[PDB]
Point group: C3
Chain length 238, copies 3
Amino acid sequence: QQPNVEGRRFSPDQVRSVAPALEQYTQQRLYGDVWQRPGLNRRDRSLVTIAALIARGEAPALTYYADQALENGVKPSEISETITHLAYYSGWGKAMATVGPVSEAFAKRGIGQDQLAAVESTPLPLDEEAEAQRATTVGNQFGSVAPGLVQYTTDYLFRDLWLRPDLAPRDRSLVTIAALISVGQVEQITFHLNKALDNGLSEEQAAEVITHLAFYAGWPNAMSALPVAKAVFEKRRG
Amino acid sequence: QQPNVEGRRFSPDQVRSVAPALEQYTQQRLYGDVWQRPGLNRRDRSLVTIAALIARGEAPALTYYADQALENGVKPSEISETITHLAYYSGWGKAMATVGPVSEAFAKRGIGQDQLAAVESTPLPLDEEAEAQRATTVGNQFGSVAPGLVQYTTDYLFRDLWLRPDLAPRDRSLVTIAALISVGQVEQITFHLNKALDNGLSEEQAAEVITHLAFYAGWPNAMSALPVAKAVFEKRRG
Amino acid sequence: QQPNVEGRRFSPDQVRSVAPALEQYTQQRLYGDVWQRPGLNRRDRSLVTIAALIARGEAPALTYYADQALENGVKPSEISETITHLAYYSGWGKAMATVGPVSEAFAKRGIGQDQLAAVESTPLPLDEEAEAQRATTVGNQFGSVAPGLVQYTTDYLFRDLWLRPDLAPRDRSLVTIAALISVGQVEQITFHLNKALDNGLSEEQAAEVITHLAFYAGWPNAMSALPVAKAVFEKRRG
């Protein structure tokens, strides 16, 4: 039920040499059920999975998963941009680790540099009022605690990274929430889940993201996200 | 004082080329003292260590540590089942990473597939009342937040994984608490430590688990577990 | 703007084959701006970076970063001691992972074992009253919860590791706060940041540490440290 078995790091035979139950579960549950849940499509699941693997330092799995993402209709430029985005959100080393595995995936598919996310291009429109509010809140709270970090947050992230067009805002928020959930960073989920929902991700899609990540990032990480998600959904109803 | 020095990823000579104090501490403190603490036996320490290495993405160390576990009397089927269990609790990629290192450990010992945990076998008895209570609690709290995840929790975990006989309930709880502590997932320790104690793990054994993990998962992770453990021990006395 | 381009795991060409924007950001922002911020010098930034890479299981990057640290004036003995220190604070496996990459860095520079941190040497002076207070607090709270861990905390850490002269107290605290921030261990930052400030790290230096780590350990980790740092700074003013 899993596509492109030959592209896997470890073969079904190899997995069965240690844990045949795991191989069966991979086929019947992970690929046969989770990946088949229609509330979130294969393209979006690929973005969520790539984000999880990057955030969790499981870059070797990316050769297979990046190839699958391309097959599922994720653009090379979107994979490219996910890596750049997660340099900031997961850390530079986590992004750098992707270079070998993803370059291999691209090379096999004949994906040249001309298909990648632009170094510099026309920014998306900035909601100036919401940004003025965001900057004021952070500056008032932490401006004298870490002035450099506060300034970088504004200049590098909210006035640049988040306006880069190579991921649609919805998709950039999607990869962000996936990366956060994947490493249990529940403190930052409220802001970014609200942003994702504002950007067009549906509540059921968000529930599917959490559900998908139970498998890729472990049950406790998915479980920890639930009260945060619940609070967000309830607050939007007020 | 450390057994099977030749089976290590890095030799004592190699460790001494960077940090001779670390090599000395490994011999005198880790192997000479911690591993020798009689409150928790070598077999259980091996299970705790394997769980920690899996959860923390330190799979390369597993060739040595899985071999040691087998020497310490952990069954191949128990190692097999730990991997499958932690696919769910640590994440699929963390379990998958074990395949290469553990297959090598098994191959060297002539451990064939006939010795592994069963794909499907007769489930252990389910405490139907405690399960009805568990399902009701979760369903009431998060049923409309992530219905898919709630259903999978019931169907995949509590009505299947936890009833698989290839780990005794005590040992399955042992590996779970070890994996949780190892990545600082304190939110889920209350439930699983209670379950471990219910399943027959002693309070002193649990204290030894936390102590062992200070070395393998870092002091802060062990320290973070202490107030949770304290609260559990005190609550059971009420 | 990045020194020793040829020593990198992945070349600029390789990074550009996946994410040319990331390569540009590395040059212009990470190396061209962050590393150039004068509030924290290159030597201290190297210690912070090594600690982050060790804590986050990004040991492969260490060949380049350890070489850079040596170029920046970090002593071989200080790198040696950072590894030993983080065996305790990040975990044994995280320290062990450094052996290959750092040994390579040392070999290329002709750094022999005679330049490494001493296995045993004359301890630094212990503040006996502050230690009596620390031991009493921990013993009263957790002495009967995990007696072994409480005893090891005293004997292995505060009456040995922290008195080892191969890192100055300021630098040992620096590597500790870096390692904690890098994996989001906010629970332990209050104690260790106070200790760092007591040991001579300035508040602006601490702010630069957090800022540097936003890039190496991801924005959310740096952001999570801010309220802890704020509370510490404010408390010292009372």
